[PDB]
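Weekly modeling sync, notes
Attendees: AB, CL, MP (scribe)

Item 1: holo prediction request
CL wants a bound-state model with zinc ion before deciding which constructs to order. AB pointed out that an apo prediction alone won't tell us much about the pocket. Agreed to run with the ligand included and paste results into these notes for async review.

Input as submitted:
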Amino acid sequence: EIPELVPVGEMPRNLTMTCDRYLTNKVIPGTRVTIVGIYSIYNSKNGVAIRTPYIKILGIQSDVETSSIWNSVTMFTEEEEEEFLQLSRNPKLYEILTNSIAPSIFGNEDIKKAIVCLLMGGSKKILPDGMRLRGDINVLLLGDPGTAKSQLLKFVEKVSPIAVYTSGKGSSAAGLTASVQRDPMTREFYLEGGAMVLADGGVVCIDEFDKMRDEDRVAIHEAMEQQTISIAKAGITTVLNSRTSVLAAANPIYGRYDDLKSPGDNIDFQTTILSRFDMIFIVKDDHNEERDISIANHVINIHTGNANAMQNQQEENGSEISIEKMKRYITYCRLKCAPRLSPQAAEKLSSNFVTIRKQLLINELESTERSSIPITIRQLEAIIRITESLAKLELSPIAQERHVDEAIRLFQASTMDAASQLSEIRRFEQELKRRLPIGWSTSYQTLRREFVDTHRFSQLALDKALYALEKHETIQLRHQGQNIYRSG
Amino acid sequence: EISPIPQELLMKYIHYARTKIYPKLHQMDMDKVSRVYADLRRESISTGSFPITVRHLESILRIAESFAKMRLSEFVSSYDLDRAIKVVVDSFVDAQKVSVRRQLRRSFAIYTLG
Amino acid sequence: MYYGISQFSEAYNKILRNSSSHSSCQLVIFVSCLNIDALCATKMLSLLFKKQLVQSQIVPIFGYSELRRHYSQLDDNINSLLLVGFGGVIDLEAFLEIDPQEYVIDTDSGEQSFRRDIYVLDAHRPWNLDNIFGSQIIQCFDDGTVDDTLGEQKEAYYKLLELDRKQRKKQIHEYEGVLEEYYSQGTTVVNSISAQIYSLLSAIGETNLSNLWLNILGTTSLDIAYAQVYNRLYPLLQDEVKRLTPSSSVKTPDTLTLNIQPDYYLFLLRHSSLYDSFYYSNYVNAKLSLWNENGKKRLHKMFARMGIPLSTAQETWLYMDHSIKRELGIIFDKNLDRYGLQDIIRDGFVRTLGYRGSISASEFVEALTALLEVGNNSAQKLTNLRKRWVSNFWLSWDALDDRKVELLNRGIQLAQDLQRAIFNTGVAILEKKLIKHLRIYRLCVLQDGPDLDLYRNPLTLLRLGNWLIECCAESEDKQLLPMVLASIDENTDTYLVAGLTPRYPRGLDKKPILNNFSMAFQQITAETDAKVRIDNFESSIIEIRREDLSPFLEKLTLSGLL
Amino acid sequence: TLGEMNSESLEVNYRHLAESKAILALFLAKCPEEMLKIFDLVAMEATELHYPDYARIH
Amino acid sequence: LRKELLKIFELREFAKVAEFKDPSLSLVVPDFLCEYCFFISDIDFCKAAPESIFSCVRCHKAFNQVLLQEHLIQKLRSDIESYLIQDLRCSRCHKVKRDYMSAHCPCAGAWEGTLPRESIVQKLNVFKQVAKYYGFDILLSCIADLTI
Ligand SMILES: Nc1ncnc2c1ncn2[C@@H]1O[C@H](COP(=O)(O)OP(=O)(O)O)[C@@H](O)[C@H]1O
Ligand SMILES: [Zn+2]
Ligand SMILES: [Zn+2]
C-alpha cells in the first residue's frame, strides 16, 4: 500500500493480485500504480473457514511507469511529442529545469544543476572489444546539517521515473544489491533483487552515506562503476545488470564541516569511493546575513502557504514545470537522445583535465600528504558524462563547446571547490607590515625581486602569505592583481 | 491544589487538540522571527555555541503552532510568536557559557519583552 | 420609454436597416464582460446575427475608461452600437462627449435622423432621465418600468426642459425635488437581459432549444442575490420549455432533452460527491452553521439519519449506488424538515444530450462564473490584468458551445477549487472575527490569508461576499446591514472594496432592498481628494490606496447615505 | 456518537449493569453468548429508535 | 514605548515600514576651501542648510556658484571614472581579476563589479535632484549631455 496512506502504528499489508492476457508484464516492481479490479476470494492450500482474498486485475494505470518492460520504445503521443520538442527548442530550458528542481529550497543552484544532469544522465556506449563505459553520474552531497540535502534526495526520488530512497543505517549488503533467498516449497535458492535492482535504469538515493557500514559500503563499488552485480553464492553465480545513478548524502566525521580543521580529518572515506563519485559537493554554512534573511523569508513563505501561491503562479508563467511533465521529459530524453562529442570539444576537455591535474600538483605540494579528494581519469569520464547530459537536456545530438564550458563550470564548482579546502609566515607578515605602510601600494615585481631573488623566503611562502593577508582583509589586491595595497 | 486542570480532563484535552485542531500561520508577524533567526545565526559564531540552522526557524514555527494548538485556536496569534521566540531565546541563552549570558540576554531582550 | 417590449422587433429591424450589408462591417456589440447575463445575451444575439448574416464585432469591456478608449477609437463607418449589461446609469452624452450637431444627417418637417445608433441593454433599474427621455441617439431596451413607475419623473423632466417669482420657483423647485428624489436612489435589478432578448426573439420568431437554454442560463445566473427576479421569470421559462419540447423514449445519441425536474439548491451535485455538495453549499452552511466543528458533527449526524453512509456519500455522483440517488427525493422529503433544510427542494431545468451525462442550469452557471474568474509601472499591470480577464471571458464564451465540453469540465474543476478557496477564506473570516460592527454597516477587511491573489478578481470577491451575506442572513440576532468587503493587493498595493447588500432568508416570501453604496462612493469621491477608481460597471466596486483606506471608511461611516 | 462516524460498536460499562439490573449482569457473566445475541438486537432497536433506516448503513 | 506607539497606527513591532531609514542621501564634496580664511571643509549639499552651503562656515563670505558647479562636475566625473576603471571580483571566491579576459573564475563564480550597479545611478539621481533644487544650470546641462 501507499506509505502516505498507511494507518497509525501499523505495517503496510502485502496483498496478492493476478493479471491475465495482455495485462501481464506491464509493471516494473517499485512503481506507484492505480488498479481497478474485482475483489474475489480463492482457496489456498495453507484455522476455520479462512479463505484468502485476492484482486483480479481489470485495469492498470500509472503515469510514473512507462512502456511496461523497457524496450527503448516510443509510446508518447504525437501532440505531447510536439510539446516536448517545443520544450527542447526553448532557449532557456536549462533555467526551467533548474527552477523545477526544489522550488521550496533556497540557494543550492549548482546542486540543482547537478541533479538535472543526474536525471538526464549520460550515454551508454558499446565498444567492439567489449569495453563498457558508464552512462550515469553519481553525486555525493557532503556537508553540514540544515542544508536540506535529504529534502533534495526526496525530491529526486519524486521526480525520477525509476527511483528508490534508502538509508545508511537501515541498509545492508544483501539489501542494496541483490539477495539470495530460499523458496519455501521447492527448497531451492533463488536471487531476489534489492534496492539497486529495483532502481535499474534509474536513481538510487542514499541518506546518511557517512554512517553505512564498512562491509556495507564496499558491495556497491561494482554496482556504481561496472553497472553490474556479480554474485556467486549458494551454488548460483550470475552477473546481473544494475544501471543505477547514485545520489548519496553525508555529513563529515566531525559534527559540522570545519574550515579551521583539515579536510583529511573531516573525511574518513577511502579515496576509492570519492573516485567513484562524480560531483563531490561539499557545502558549508557561511552565516551571511543576506543569506540568512533570504532563507528566513523563503521558509516563512513556505510555512504560511504563500509559496504555494508563488509556485502556482510561476507554473502558469511558464518558467517551471511540474513533476509529471519533467518525469516524462526525463524518460523521453533518455529514450531518444544519446549524443557524441565534436572534435573541437575534445581539445577543450583534455586541456581542462590536464589543467586541473596540474592544479592538483599545486594542491598536493605544500601539504606533503595525499589529498582525500582525488581527481583521476574517471573524473574526466565524469565531465564527459556531464557534457553529454547537458546535450541531452535540449535533445541535441552534438555536444558543442557551449555545453562544454558549463560542464567545466559545474566540475569547478563541485570537485575543484571540494579539493581546494612557520617562521616564514610571521617573518613575512612583520617585514611586509613594516615594509609598505598603511595606504600605499607596491607592485608584485618588486616583491618578486626583493623577496624571492633575495631568497628571503620561498616563492610558495610568498604566494601563500599574500592570500593569508588577503583573507585577513588588512592588505588587499588592486589594479588587475598587479598592485598590493594596504587597506589599513 | 497541585494542578489547576484535572489529569483525566488534561489527557483527553491533549488528544483532542492533537487529532482535531490544526493551527496555521496566516496573520502572524513573520518579520520579528526573521530578525530573531538572523541574530541567532550571528551569535552562533562561537566555537562551542549551540548550532542554529534553518531547522531552528522551523522549530520556532512549530513551537508557535503548538502554543496556538494549546488554546484550541485554529489561527496563530502574535502572542504565540512572542512566547515561541521567548522559549527559543531562553534555551539559547541557557545553552551559552556564563561569561556571555549577560551580553546574550541583553542582545535579544528587545524581541522577548518587547 | 423609447422602446417598449412590443416594439423590440421594430428596433431589430432598424438594426438591419443600418447593418444588413455584405460589403462592410457596421455593427459593433459592446458587451460588459465579467457578467454571465451579458455573456448569454451576447451569445443569443450572435446566434441571431449569424442566422441572418449581420457583420459584427463583439468587444468585451471591463471599465468605464476602457469603454471611453474603445468608443474614442471607433471608425465613423459604424452606425449600430449595442451596449450589453451596462450604460443604463451614467449619462452617455456627458461621458462619451456626444453632441448631436456633428452626428445628424438629413434633418429635412419635424424629422431627425442620425448616422450612429447606440442601443442599451442594461438591467440596472436606476435609469438616467436624460438618457431615457431627452436622448434620440441613445436608445433603451426598457423592460416596462417606465410605463408603470417613471411617469411622474417623465412629466417633471418634460416641464423642466420645456420651461427654460413664486410661480416659477414653486413649480420648478418642486419638479427638481421630484427628480432629485428619483435620483440618489439605490441600484436594483428586476429583469434579466436574456429574458428581454428572448422576448425579442419571440417577437421575431427565431426561438429554438439553444436560445431557450441560453435564456435559462441567463435567468438562473441571477438566483444568488436576486431570487425575486428568478421567481418572477420562472413561469415564462416553464411555458417555453413545455412549448418547445418534443412529443416524447429511449436514450439515443442525438436526442437533446431539457426537462423540468427536481434540481436541488446545491453546489455541483451531479459533478461532485453528495458530501462535498452539502459541505460546500451556501444554504446548508447558512442554516446548519458548518463553519465550526459542531456543524460538521450535525452534518455527519444527519447523514446517519438519512441512511446514507459516508463511504457512499463521498463517492462520485455518477458512480454512486442508485439505491441512494433514485429515492433521494423521498429521503429529502422525510429527513430535511427536522434540520430546517426544507428549501433544498426546488424544481429546475436539467439538459442532457447523447450519453455524456446531465447538466443543470445552476451547475452550468457556476462553471461559467468560475471560467470568468480563474479561467486562465502599475498601469501596465492593470492593463495586462484587464486583458487577462478579457481572455477569461472569451474562454467562458468558448465553453458555451456544445462541441467544447472539455472547457465545461475544466470549469467544473475550477469551480470546485475556487469554492474550496472561498470556503477556507470564509471560515478564516468567521473564526478570528474580523467582521466589525459600525452601527450603520458591517466592515470586513482582509489583510492576509490563503491565496489572496484570487481576490483581485471582482466576482471572486462577490462570491465571498454572497457567502458572508448568506451566512449572516440566517442569524436573526444581528439585523440587516450593508457590508463593506475590502481585499488588499500587495503588488498593485490597492484595497479593492465591494459593497454588498443584505437579504432576507430564502424561506420567507416583498419589496427588494436597494444598493446605497454608489451614492456615498460618488459623494466621497467628489468631496474628498481620494485617488479612487469608479470605472467598474457595478458601481459598488471601487479601488482605494492602502494609505487612504481608513479616511475613506471614516467618511463613509460619517455619511448617512448607506 | 455511534452514528457520528458510522461506527458499529456500542460500548457498555459493566458497572452500569451492576448498579441497575444486576440480574442482567449475572446472566451476562454466566451465559455471555446468548446474552450478547439478545443484546445486539436490543442495541439495534435502540439505535433505530433514534436513527431510523440505520440498517442500510450497517 | 515604540511598541505601544505603533499599536495605534495598526502596525506590528518589526514591520517593513516601521523600521527607520535616513531620509537624506549623503552628497559630499571633499575639501572645498574658502580663499578668505582658508578653512578647508567638506560641504554636504543634502544634509546642510542652504545658508551654510553658499558661504563659509566661519568667515560667512559667500562663494560664487560657478566653482560650486565646477566641483560638482568634478565629483560626478570622478564617480563615473571610478565606475569605468574597476576591478571585477568573484561572487564566491572574492578574488581580483588577474587574467584580464576570461569567462569565469576557477571557483566558477560570476564576475561582479566592486562598485554596485545601483550605487552610481543613485549618485547620479541625487545629482539630478540637487541640480533641480539649487538651480545649477551648468549641472543640469551636464545631465542633459550625459543622457544624450
Ligand atoms: N534552503 C532551505 N529551504 C527550505 N528548507 C530548508 C532549507 N535548508 C534547510 N531546510 C530545512 O531544514 C531541514 C534540513 O534537513 P537536512 O539537512 O535535509 O537533513 P540532513 O542533515 O540529514 O541532510 C529540512 O527539514 C528542511 O525542511
Ligand atoms: Zn572662510
Ligand atoms: Zn571564484
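Recorded for review: The beta strands of chain E are 28-33, 40-44, 88-90, 111-113.
Action items: CL to compare against the apo run; MP to circulate these notes.
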